[PDB]
Design an enzyme around this catalytic site. Structure first.
Site, PDB file in Angstrom:
ATOM      1  N   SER A 250       0.253  -0.240   7.031  1.00 13.50           N
ATOM      2  CA  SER A 250       1.580  -0.649   7.530  1.00 13.50           C
ATOM      3  C   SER A 250       1.501  -1.219   8.940  1.00 13.50           C
ATOM      4  CB  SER A 250       2.567   0.511   7.469  1.00 13.50           C
ATOM      5  OG  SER A 250       3.008   0.717   6.110  1.00 13.50           O
ATOM      6  N   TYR A 253       1.386  -4.910   9.635  1.00 16.24           N
ATOM      7  CA  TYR A 253       2.634  -5.668   9.515  1.00 16.24           C
ATOM      8  C   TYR A 253       3.523  -5.586  10.755  1.00 16.24           C
ATOM      9  CZ  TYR A 253       1.051  -6.131   4.804  1.00 16.24           C
ATOM     10  OH  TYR A 253       0.282  -6.307   3.695  1.00 16.24           O
ATOM     11  N   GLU A 334      -0.426   0.330  -2.253  1.00 18.65           N
ATOM     12  CA  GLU A 334       0.925  -0.095  -1.843  1.00 18.65           C
ATOM     13  C   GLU A 334       1.930   0.409  -2.874  1.00 18.65           C
ATOM     14  OE1 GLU A 334       1.006  -4.420  -1.821  1.00 18.65           O
ATOM     15  OE2 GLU A 334      -0.858  -4.548  -0.671  1.00 18.65           O
TER      16      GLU A 334
HETATM   17  C1  LIG Z   1       8.168  -8.580   2.612  1.00 21.09           C
HETATM   18  N1  LIG Z   1       8.011  -7.106   2.758  1.00 21.09           N
HETATM   19  N2  LIG Z   1       9.175  -6.361   2.364  1.00 21.09           N
HETATM   20  C2  LIG Z   1       8.936  -5.071   2.526  1.00 21.09           C
HETATM   21  N3  LIG Z   1       7.672  -4.991   3.037  1.00 21.09           N
HETATM   22  C3  LIG Z   1       7.045  -6.222   3.206  1.00 21.09           C
HETATM   23  C4  LIG Z   1       5.589  -6.444   3.743  1.00 21.09           C
HETATM   24  C5  LIG Z   1       5.207  -5.275   4.270  1.00 21.09           C
HETATM   25  N4  LIG Z   1       6.019  -4.895   5.302  1.00 21.09           N
HETATM   26  N5  LIG Z   1       5.791  -3.612   5.855  1.00 21.09           N
HETATM   27  C6  LIG Z   1       4.774  -2.776   5.335  1.00 21.09           C
HETATM   28  O1  LIG Z   1       4.562  -1.684   5.862  1.00 21.09           O
HETATM   29  C7  LIG Z   1       4.003  -3.175   4.233  1.00 21.09           C
HETATM   30  C8  LIG Z   1       3.061  -2.302   3.728  1.00 21.09           C
HETATM   31  C9  LIG Z   1       2.286  -2.645   2.636  1.00 21.09           C
HETATM   32  F1  LIG Z   1       1.328  -1.626   2.153  1.00 21.09           F
HETATM   33  C10 LIG Z   1       2.460  -3.910   2.051  1.00 21.09           C
HETATM   34  C11 LIG Z   1       3.410  -4.781   2.598  1.00 21.09           C
HETATM   35  C12 LIG Z   1       4.195  -4.433   3.682  1.00 21.09           C
HETATM   36  N6  LIG Z   1       3.538  -6.036   2.084  1.00 21.09           N
HETATM   37  C13 LIG Z   1       4.687  -6.861   2.502  1.00 21.09           C
HETATM   38  C14 LIG Z   1       4.682  -8.204   2.554  1.00 21.09           C
HETATM   39  C15 LIG Z   1       4.942  -8.811   1.335  1.00 21.09           C
HETATM   40  C16 LIG Z   1       5.163 -10.160   1.280  1.00 21.09           C
HETATM   41  C17 LIG Z   1       5.158 -10.904   2.439  1.00 21.09           C
HETATM   42  F2  LIG Z   1       5.400 -12.773   2.282  1.00 21.09           F
HETATM   43  C18 LIG Z   1       4.945 -10.273   3.672  1.00 21.09           C
HETATM   44  C19 LIG Z   1       4.739  -8.919   3.740  1.00 21.09           C
END
Ligand SMILES: Cn1ncnc1[C@H]1c2n[nH]c(=O)c3cc(F)cc(c23)N[C@@H]1c1ccc(F)cc1
Length: 356
Positions: A250, A253, A334
């Protein structure tokens, strides 16, 4: 009255700093500069939802042209229409022609960030701009979210710090994480919206990272699913709300940098129900019956024998072990839900990223 009433904030100091960080106009401006937006044509105050929706739809048409066949004419048109909605600074380097998946996906991610910036900014400029009260407190109120500092010696804090310490690795060893503050949050209305989904089993407390400039929007409106207008490009498991069970995942991001090395990450209670478990990408319209979420299986998982419960809320805080998982591209697990009401935000952490 009998008392003099100070114009100072009535909030504790860490909450004050949180509010300033998420309503930081300077950060909004830097973002715009980084996106190479023409700031005289499209200042912060001029961003709008309708504009952003239309620009998303344009990007979906670019995506359809990339998958189903394009002409030069069509691509040029869609690029011209996109940049008319989101003006590009000609003082800066030529903007990318929108004719490929990377550009489409970078622009869609821009639009996600800009939408939350627009939300932050409109909250900030709205309201009664009279000095009847401290600016900090007024902006706090606009979040319609109760935010309290969690005492550092409380049970919650010990559990939370443990979840962080254990699920942070020597793989993404660009930085180590340090918890600065732990906030307990409750968004107005969310507990009621969540209730029916509390009935589902497999409720888990999971991480969700995002850019700091998105948190005003996140707290006022909650976590959202990308809209229908948004392109599907780059959504590994389609348009839903994504969570990790390892803080390392996380934290990426947060998109924090050596320049600004503090980020914000949520802990949310997510009603997963039965999980459709997968080892590779698969854009999801419908879900199989019996399933209420997706789980992307990674090579590394928190040790399930070191897992704990809270309110009957599973906290997977075990140290990271090899999942044994055969043939997966994902480094980490995820979890994705496809209904906004399956999420109840509980905590917000402010973390220091100590890069190497
Ligand atoms: C778009 N989005 N909506 C809720 N979360 C997210 C992102 C992400 N946000 N935050 C997280 O902690 C996260 C943790 C993961 F294991 C996986 C994740 C995320 N994938 C996500 C991702 C997906 C598509 C994208 F064009 C950009 C980012």
């Amino acid at each position: 009255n009998l008392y003099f009433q100070s114009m100072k904030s009535k909030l504790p100091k860490p909450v004050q700093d949180l509010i300033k960080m998420i309503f930081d106009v300077e950060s909004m401006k830097k973002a715009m500069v980084e996106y190479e937006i023409d700031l005289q044509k499209m200042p912060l105050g001029k961003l709008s939802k309708r504009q952003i929706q239309a620009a998303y739809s344009i990007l979906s048409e670019v995506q359809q042209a990339v998958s189903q066949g394009s002409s030069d004419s069509q691509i040029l048109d869609l690029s011209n229409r996109f940049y008319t909605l989101i003006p590009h600074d000609f003082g800066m380097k030529k903007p990318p022609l929108l004719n490929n998946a990377d550009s489409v996906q970078a622009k869609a991610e821009m639009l996600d960030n800009l939408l939350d910036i627009e939300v932050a900014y409109s909250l900030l400029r709205g309201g009664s701009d009279d000095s009847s009260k401290d600016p900090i407190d007024v902006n706090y109120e606009k979040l319609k979210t109760d935010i309290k500092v969690v005492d550092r010696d409380s049970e919650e804090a010990e559990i939370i710090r443990k979840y962080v310490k254990n699920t942070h690795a020597t793989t993404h060893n660009a930085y180590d994480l340090e918890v600065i503050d732990i906030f307990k949050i409750e968004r107005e209305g969310e507990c009621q919206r969540y209730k029916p989904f509390k009935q589902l089993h497999n409720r888990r407390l999971l991480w969700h990272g995002s850019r700091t400039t998105n948190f005003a929007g996140i707290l006022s409106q909650g976590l959202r699913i990308a809209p229908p207008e948004a392109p599907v490009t780059g959504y590994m498991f389609g348009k839903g709300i994504y969570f990790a069970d390892m803080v390392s995942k996380s934290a990426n991001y947060c998109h924090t940098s050596q320049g600004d090395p503090i980020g914000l990450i949520l802990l949310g209670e997510v009603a997963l129900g039965n999980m459709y478990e997968l080892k590779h990408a698969s854009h999801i319209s419908k879900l199989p019956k019996g399933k209420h979420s997706v789980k992307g299986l990674g090579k590394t998982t928190p040790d399930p024998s070191a897992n704990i419960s809270l309110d009957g809320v599973d906290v997977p805080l075990g140290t990271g072990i090899s999942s044994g998982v055969n043939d997966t591209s994902l480094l980490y697990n995820e979890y994705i839900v496809y209904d906004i009401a399956q999420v109840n935000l509980k905590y917000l952490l402010k973390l220091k990223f100590n890069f190497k």
